[PDB]
Copies of this chain bind each other. A is one copy, B any other.
Amino acid sequence: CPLMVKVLDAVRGSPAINVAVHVFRKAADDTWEPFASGKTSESGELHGLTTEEEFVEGIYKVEIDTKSYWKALGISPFHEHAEVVFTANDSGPRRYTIAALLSPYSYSTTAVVTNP
């Protein structure tokens, strides 16, 4: 429950379905270690990536594979992916929704951070 990703398509006005998402966590030696991955559902949501126990303090990167999404719709987009990089749980455990809104040459991302 502590990390969820939601992806919307600004061209079609719909969830962005079947988008690949890779999460990484910065290690002590400053490299990016693979942490979790998955794909968005029919609702454009990806749940279940991690657990309260596993999701410790750290710097996390959420890489959303926007380029494969657009190419499967016949569009050659600008970006390789959308990356969202952030420190998590620095003030204690929180619940993070990482939302992204996609267009071929543009994206936006926002975080909704809540305290259970």
In the complex, chain B residues whose CB is within 8 Å of the CB of A75: 11
**Segment touching B, from A33-41, A48-56, A104-112:** A104-112
Instruction: Count contacts on A: residues with CB < 8 A to the other chain.
Output: 33
A1-26 interface code vs B (CB 8 A; 1 in, 0 out): 00000001111111100000000000
Partner pick for A14 among B9, B15, B114, CB 8 A cutoff: B114
Q: How many copies does the complex hold?
A: 4
| A11 contact set on B, CB distance < 8 A | 11, 75, 103-105
Cα distance A107–B13 in the bound complex, in angstroms: 11
A residues contacting B by CB (< 8 A) are 8-15, 59, 75, 78-81, 83-87, 99, 101, 103-114
